[PDB]
RNA sequence: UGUUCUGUGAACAC
RNA sequence: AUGUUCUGUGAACA
RNA sequence: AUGUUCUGUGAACAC
RNA sequence: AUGUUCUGUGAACAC
C-alpha cells in the first residue's frame, strides 16, 4: 500500500541484516554496529544519526582492510625509507631532542641565520655528546623542519637565504610537536598506518608518549580522510592484485565517504537513506567475507 | 616538605573525580586546579584561586541538590510573598510598572496609598483582578529594591519619589527583576537565566538580560553570602548528612583573596586550602551518592 | 568496562 | 585581551 | 648505509 | 491562595 514506504523498508532490512553480526568482528566495529542499530529510522533525527553511523562504520571498514594488507615486521624500515626519500632523517630519541634544542638555542630570539650557519651551529655544539654528528646528518634534520614549514625564509638577490623560526615554534614543546607531526605526515603520505604506541616507541624510545602522538594523529584527520583512505586502499590492492575483488566495494565506500559527518548537516532524503544503508551493508559484508575466506 | 606533599596528595585525590558524575562546571574547575604546578610560586597562587573557585561552585551544587526542579517556581513565589511582595504575571507587571512611571517619571512625590490607587484605577480595565492588596505587593517589591526616595511627614503618610536613576522603564524593570533574583538568592534558590526569562517574561528571549543581572550581583562577597544561604536551606531541611561540618572549610576558602595581584600563600596556607577544598568536594560527592533527594 | 585523544556555536561580566 | 555561564561530537588502544 | 656540495616543502654527486 | 488596614527594605488582621 501507499502507507508503506519502500525506501524505509530496505533501510530497515539492511540494518536488521547487519544486526545479525552482533549476536566475528572487532570491538570498534561492534560499537559502531550498535550505534547504527540504535538509530530510530521513524524519526528524522534518527535518520540523520543513521547516515553518520553508516559513514563511521564504513571509514572503520577501510582502515581494517588496509591494516590486513600491511607488513608489521617491515613497518619501521618503510617509515625511515619514506623519511629518507624526502631528504629527512631521525637520529634517535636522544640525539634528535638535543638537535632540536640546539636549533632553538640559535633561533628562539628571532635571529635569521643561513642553512649552512644553522647546521654548523648545531653540529659543533652536538659533536661532544654525539660524535657521529655531521653536516649531512644534521642537514637532514633541518630539512625535516623546513618541510614542516617551521621557518620563515627570506630570499636575498644572488646570496644564501636567511631562515627564522616562526613565532609559534619558538618553544621546544611547539617545535617538537610540529617535528613529530611532520614524520607522521610522511608516514601517512607513504600509506603507512602506525599506532600511537608504535609512534611513542619510534620517536621517544618509551610508551609514555601515546597520548601526545594520539593528539597529533587526531588533529591531522579531516573529513577528506575517508575519501583519501579509499584511494589509498585502491593503491594497496593494485600492488597486491586483489584476489577477493574488494574493488567492487569502491562506489559504496565513495558514497559513504561523501556523507556529511557534521551534526548540523542537511537531513537525508528517503532515497539517500536506502542507498547509505545498502552501501554500508555491502561494505561490512565484504570485510567479513575477506576475514573468513582471504585471511 | 610535608606541606607540599599533603597539598599534592589532596589534588591527586580530587583528580580521581575526573574519571567516574560531577557537573560540567565542577569538572572544568577541577581541571584548572589539577593543572596548577605546585613546585612554582605562580602555580601555588593559581591553586589557591582554583580552590576558592571550586569551593564557591560546590556551595552552588549543594544548594541545587536541595532543589526539586518541579517545585522551583512555587518556592520562588512563596519566598516573594514572604517579603510582602508579588509578581502578577509578565503582562500585568509590565503594565503596573509603566503606570508607576506614569505617576513618578517627572519626580512627583506621592503617598503609598495614592500611588497604589493611581495604578489600580488605570490597570483595572485591562486586568479586572487588580486590587489595592495585589498592587501594594508590587509597590513593596520596588520599596524593598530601594527604588524610592522616602520623605517622612509628622503625623502623616510618607511621600515617595522614584530616584532619578529609575525614571525610565528599562532601568526600573531591571532593578525590579534584580530584586526578585535577590529574594531567590536569599531563600537559597539558584535559577538559570533561561528559567528566569520564562518566569519573568513568559519567553526565552530575555536570557541575556537576566544573565546580565545575575553576573552583576556576583562579587567576592558572594561566596560568603552563599554559605549563609546554604545554612538557611539546611535549617529548613534538617541536615541529615551534617553538611554543617563543612562550614569552617567553606569559610576558609571564602576568605581566600580572588584577585590575581594577591599575596602568594605560605606552605601552611597551601596545605589548609587543599585540605579544605578536598573535604568540601568529598562532602558533595558523599551527599549525591548517600543522601540523594 | 578501563586508558586516552578529539570536537561547536551562543550570550554575559570588566 | 582576560574571565563566567550555556551549548555542541566523534575517534584510538586492550 | 655513510659522507660531501647547495639559496632546496628538496636537488646533485662520491664511496 | 485571596482580601482589608498601615508612614512598612515590611507589620498586623480577616476569611
Ligand atoms: Cl512504512
Author numbering:
A (entry chain B): 88 to 110, 125 to 396
B (entry chain A): 92 to 111, 125 to 397
What does the paper behind this entry write?
Roquins are a family of RNA-binding proteins critically involved in maintaining peripheral immunological tolerance and preventing autoimmune diseases. The human genome encodes two Roquin paralogs, RC3H1 and RC3H2. The N-terminal regions of these two proteins are highly homologous and are composed of a RING (Really Interesting New Gene)-type E3 ubiquitin ligase domain, followed by a unique, so-called ROQ domain of approximately 300 amino acid residues and a CCCH-type ZnF domain5. The ROQ domain binds to a highly conserved, stem-loop-forming constitutive decay element (CDE), which is found in the 3′ UTR of many mRNAs encoding regulators of development and inflammation.
We next determined the crystal structure of RC3H2 in complex with a 15-nt constitutive decay element (CDE) of human intermediate early response 3 (Ier3) RNA at 2.5 Å resolution. Surprisingly, each asymmetric unit (ASU) contains two protein molecules, two single-stranded RNAs, and one double-stranded (ds) RNA. The single-stranded RNA binds to the winged helix-turn-helix (wHTH)-like region of the ROQ domain, similar to previously reported RC3H1 structures in complex with different CDE RNAs212223, while the RNA duplex binds to the HEPN and ROQ domains simultaneously. The single-stranded Ier3 RNA forms a stem-loop structure containing five Watson-Crick base pairs and a UGU trinucleotide loop. The stem-loop RNA interacts with the ROQ domain mainly using most of the phosphate groups in the 5′ arm and the trinucleotide loop, while the 3′ half of the stem does not form direct interaction with the protein. A detailed crystallographic analysis suggests that the two RC3H2 molecules in the ASU bind to the RNA duplex in a similar but not identical way. Both protein molecules use residues in the ROQ domain to interact with the backbone of one RNA strand (chain C), while residues in the HEPN domain interact with the backbone of the other RNA strand (chain D). Notably, side chains of Ser312, Gln315, and Asp319 of both protein molecules form hydrogen bonds with the hydroxyl group on the pentose ring of two adjacent ribonucleotides, suggesting an RNA- but not DNA-specific interaction. The most distinctive feature is the interaction between the guanidinium group of the Arg128 side chain from the HEPN domain of protein molecule A with the purine base of the central G8 from RNA chain D. In contrast, the two RC3H2 molecules in the Ier3 complex bind to the dsRNA in a head-to-toe mode, and the two protein molecules do not interact. Indeed, when RC3H2 binds to the dsRNA, the ROQ domain rotates 42° along an axis intersecting the HEPN and ROQ domains to accommodate the interactions.
